[PDB]
Design a protein around this nucleic acid. Sequence first.
RNA 1: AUUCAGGUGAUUUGCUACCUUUAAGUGCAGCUAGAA
RNA 2: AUUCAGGUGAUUUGCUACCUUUAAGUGCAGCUAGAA
RNA 3: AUUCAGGUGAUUUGCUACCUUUAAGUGCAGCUAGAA
Lengths: 162, 162, 162
Amino acid sequence: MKFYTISSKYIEYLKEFDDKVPNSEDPTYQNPKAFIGIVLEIQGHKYLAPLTSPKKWHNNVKESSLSCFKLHENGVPENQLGLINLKFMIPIIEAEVSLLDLGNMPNTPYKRMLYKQLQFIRANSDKIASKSDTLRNLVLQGKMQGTCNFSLLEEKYRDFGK
Amino acid sequence: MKFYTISSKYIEYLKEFDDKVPNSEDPTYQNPKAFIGIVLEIQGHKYLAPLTSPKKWHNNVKESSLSCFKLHENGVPENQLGLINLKFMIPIIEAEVSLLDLGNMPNTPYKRMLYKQLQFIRANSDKIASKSDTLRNLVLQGKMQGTCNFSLLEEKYRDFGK
Amino acid sequence: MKFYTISSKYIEYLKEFDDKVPNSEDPTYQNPKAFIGIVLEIQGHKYLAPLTSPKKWHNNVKESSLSCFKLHENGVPENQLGLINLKFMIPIIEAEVSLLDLGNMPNTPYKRMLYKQLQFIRANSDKIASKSDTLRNLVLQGKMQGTCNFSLLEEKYRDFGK
RNA sequence: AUUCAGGUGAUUUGCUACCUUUAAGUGCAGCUAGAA
RNA sequence: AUUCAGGUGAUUUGCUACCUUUAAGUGCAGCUAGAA
RNA sequence: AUUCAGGUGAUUUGCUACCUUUAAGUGCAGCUAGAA
Ligand SMILES: [Zn+2]
Ligand SMILES: [Zn+2]
Ligand SMILES: [Zn+2]
Ligand SMILES: [Zn+2]
Ligand SMILES: [Zn+2]
Ligand SMILES: [Zn+2]
Ligand SMILES: [Zn+2]
Ligand SMILES: [Zn+2]
Ligand SMILES: [Zn+2]
Ligand SMILES: [Zn+2]
Ligand SMILES: [Zn+2]
Ligand SMILES: [Zn+2]
């Protein structure tokens, strides 16, 4: 899996249909909001999930939860690295999605953390995909609330360019 | 698996054929003798094994032994909890066997220990069933002595009601 | 697996076809050169690999390498015990191969080390056989150089007695 | 005797794990404490 | 209540693993630093 | 940004494991040392 950004246009568009769709731009955002790379591929839908830095309430989110996949350094649990917000993953269009230029990022604390994250994500691909799959099923079945509207998003998203 | 008692009649009856069959009633017995719940099911035989509180010689009984399955609190080895005496498991008749009313036992040290035991037994079902299976095979094969007479008990036990 | 020696004749013979074939006798050799016992059995070929005591360059040989299987005491990694030189394993003829008389070796530092080695080898039989298998395939495929000439050795070796 | 097989990580120092049936990057150290 | 089943290690003290679906000696200690 | 999905244990607080393909209760804490 990999790190992506998403065009602001395309994020506004999904926001017409679901305010739950993650904010793309914010004055207080140092770097751009980043997404994780095809957490879920099903019925020809490619999903990307939002990354998000630590909040207070992440302490209550237990590992079993389908809402989030908690990140942290490999083998170093006390090094919390934020989480993947699956509850807000969205379907994407290859053309409005862009991979982070990791090969060109200046060596900074951030790019550094991205690699810590990346590796933990790489070694947990499956748990992630597995979680995303189930989250959607449930969401769709009407057994889970307060997530992104998968059903509706999946319906409207490709009508972006019109 | 679960906790059972066995009618005294039926225990006397098997004792006609094998004195090795565990004692059901004793003046020094606080609670009734308790048995563990289908350690072995084979050729339509349901086996229950006797529970037994610590004796001195349980220290010499090594884990590999087929005679006994040593109990102790989950993850707390120094908390020895007696053992399951497979060498004396017997085949039973659903109608002379009775489940302990755990849902109605007053909160006492005993009921408390039963749950410690139960869980350790639950998480080791397989080893237990596995041990019981092998113990019988061997016993039947004539490669093990000083156990209950499985072959003979299996033959005679259903003729209980006559 | 076990410890063997190989007749000097048969070792000279293979040396007619491949100088890479391990030296059998040397003035500086305390004990005879020893071989490990059927590292590989395939298309009716029985392979024995040479043992060899620590050299400087064994530090660069990584575990993944097909060239050698590094020995050392069980659970005691700092106790390097030389390595098995698979890159030089050779096919053998039961009649020119001989098992070391371990049962009759006087208790010496050497015989002592042999058992340390033996056990580590016994507990890794598979990795060894697995490595040998792959090493040959590759060697045969022409993807590996500087080893014994398996293809050529396999062809010529049985013509020993002529 | 025969003096480091080639690969798997958007990164990879040490070891280890895995792939070479054409496929494969885990784990324990170290380093880091980044922020959406 | 009923006082430790045998075995698998060219060697193996304790425990463990494992085998007794015809099979099975792993791991931790302990001892060992040996040489091709 | 967006502030804990429900389950699997004759019992189970905290975490965790597992299940969510109709399935699934593990492990570490803590509590506890009961007796056949
Ligand atoms: Zn939950
Ligand atoms: Zn974790
Ligand atoms: Zn008698
Ligand atoms: Zn035994
Ligand atoms: Zn235990
Ligand atoms: Zn290499
Ligand atoms: Zn090693
Ligand atoms: Zn034994
Ligand atoms: Zn021993
Ligand atoms: Zn949130
Ligand atoms: Zn739950
Ligand atoms: Zn709870």
